[PDB]
């Protein structure tokens, strides 16, 4: 509570935001105008480099004037103040680097060399100029051929449900109670069906463009350029080629899943 600057007329008494909540009060004994404000909350973020490397951590308070706020945790030194909020475990280094772990408002955190966790104002790129003379040009004297990568998701996983089974187990009285409500159960199933069908359709459009399945010539002499790695090997039971097989092994989902009777 604080003393106010508002001017209330002798019949007037309390304050109201558009949220219709009291913002001020007259002392029923001194008749003075006081202002209310619940104390400063926020939410908590924890920074860590990952257990494998270390066990130190940093703390951030999603916006509180840390000039006097300080959950069961203790405190310490190294209080720093950003615009986002209150950090505990960095350093106002005067260097600058590439951003590693985001924090907000141009502050990025990381771990480095005795080694501890630090912070910095993120720098973008390395500076360089382009000598512009009205009569100067630069033609390259050679070339370099490079192969890059790119991944793009195509489909999800077909799922289906059953009303009576989930909502009312097997109880007939429960089924009668579900029957009271409208066709909520029915409409739901149809929507899940729609998704499933469309998901299969997506796969077809992406890969089905070849009309006739063509086959690579037996002799693999393509002017020096080898293509063995990408070209499917018949000897390998799964027609999949070397690169394709590697990809399959990496992406693993059976960890929390079951198998390809399910």
């Amino acid at each position: 509570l604080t003393e106010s600057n508002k001017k209330f007329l002798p019949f007037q008494q309390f304050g109201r935001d558009i949220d219709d909540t009291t913002d001020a009060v007259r002392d029923p004994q001194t008749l003075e105008i006081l202002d209310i404000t619940p104390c400063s909350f926020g939410g908590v973020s924890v920074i860590t480099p990952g257990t494998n490397t270390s066990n130190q951590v940093a703390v951030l308070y999603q916006g509180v004037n840390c000039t006097e706020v300080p959950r069961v945790y203790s405190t310490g030194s190294n209080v720093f103040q950003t615009r986002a909020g209150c950090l505990i475990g960095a350093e106002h280094v005067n260097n600058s680097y590439e951003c590693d772990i985001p924090i907000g408002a141009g502050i990025c955190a990381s771990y480095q060399t005795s080694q501890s966790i630090i912070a910095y104002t993120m720098s973008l790129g390395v500076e360089n100029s382009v000598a512009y003379s009205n009569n100067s040009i630069a033609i390259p004297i050679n070339f370099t051929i490079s192969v890059t990568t790119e991944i793009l998701p195509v489909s999800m996983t077909k799922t289906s449900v059953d009303c009576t089974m989930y909502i009312c187990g097997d109880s007939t009285e429960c089924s009668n109670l579900l029957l009271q409500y409208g066709s909520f159960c029915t409409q739901l199933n149809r929507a899940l069906t729609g998704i499933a069908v469309e998901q299969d359709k997506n796969t077809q459009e992406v890969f089905a463009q070849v009309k006739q399945i063509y086959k690579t010539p037996p002799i693999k002499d393509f002017g020096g350029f080898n293509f063995s790695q990408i070209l499917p090997d018949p000897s390998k039971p799964s027609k999949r080629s070397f690169i394709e097989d590697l990809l399959f092994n990496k992406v693993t989902l059976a960890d929390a899943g079951f198998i390809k009777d399910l």
Binding site: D19, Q62, G63, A84, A105, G106, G125, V130, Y132, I137
Partner: protein, 199 residues
């Protein structure tokens, strides 16, 4: 915003500050006026601005002789047009309608959440502390229950709406990215993708 600090609607600030964003755009500009379209593929190769314009003219079809001969006219025309742009941008009604719209829409939804807080939701009072007062635990609980269900529904509605709107904003971003790659870092042959006429 601070009033929202009084209900639990904590508005978080940006990650890339507007100063940093300005720096990025200035670099793109200072690359397309000095190194042509090599400033995105490989390394920057310097080229006199007259020559850069000539290559671009050759693309649309007009032979290079026209640009090198009547350079004076092209210069004055471009300079005057930039003048008109800044004037018109400031002297109009809205112009930046789309940008303003996003802000207004998001705000309306946020406000509606704070208003539903005071609704009785079919009970006796709005203040939970007041509900507690003058109500025996048993009845108080069934009234607390009524209020809880109402509030939960409102918050769920808000979240769903936001997710749908977020998809729209993200789509517009993907279009913008494509434009930055085709129009700025080069020259587009796709008709009407970058501008009206020959780009």
């Amino acid at each position: 915003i601070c009033a929202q600090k009084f209900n639990g609607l904590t508005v978080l600030p940006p990650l890339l500050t507007d100063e940093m964003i300005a720096q990025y755009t200035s670099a793109l500009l200072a690359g397309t006026i000095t190194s042509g379209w090599t400033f995105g593929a490989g390394a920057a190769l310097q080229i006199p601005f007259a020559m850069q314009m000539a290559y671009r003219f050759n693309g649309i079809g007009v032979t290079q002789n026209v640009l090198y001969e009547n350079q004076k006219l092209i210069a004055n025309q471009f300079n005057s047009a930039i003048g008109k742009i800044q004037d018109s941008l400031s002297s109009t009604a809205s112009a930046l309608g789309k940008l303003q719209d996003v802000v207004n829409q998001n705000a309306q939804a946020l406000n509606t959440l704070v208003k539903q807080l005071s609704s009785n939701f079919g009970a006796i009072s709005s203040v939970l502390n007041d509900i507690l007062a003058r109500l025996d635990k048993v009845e108080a609980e069934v009234q607390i229950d009524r209020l809880i269900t109402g509030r939960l529904q409102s918050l769920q509605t808000y979240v769903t709406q936001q997710l749908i709107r977020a998809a729209e904003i993200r789509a517009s971003a993907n279009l913008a990215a494509t434009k930055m790659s085709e129009c700025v870092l080069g020259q587009s042959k796709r008709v009407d993708f970058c501008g009206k006429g020959y780009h």
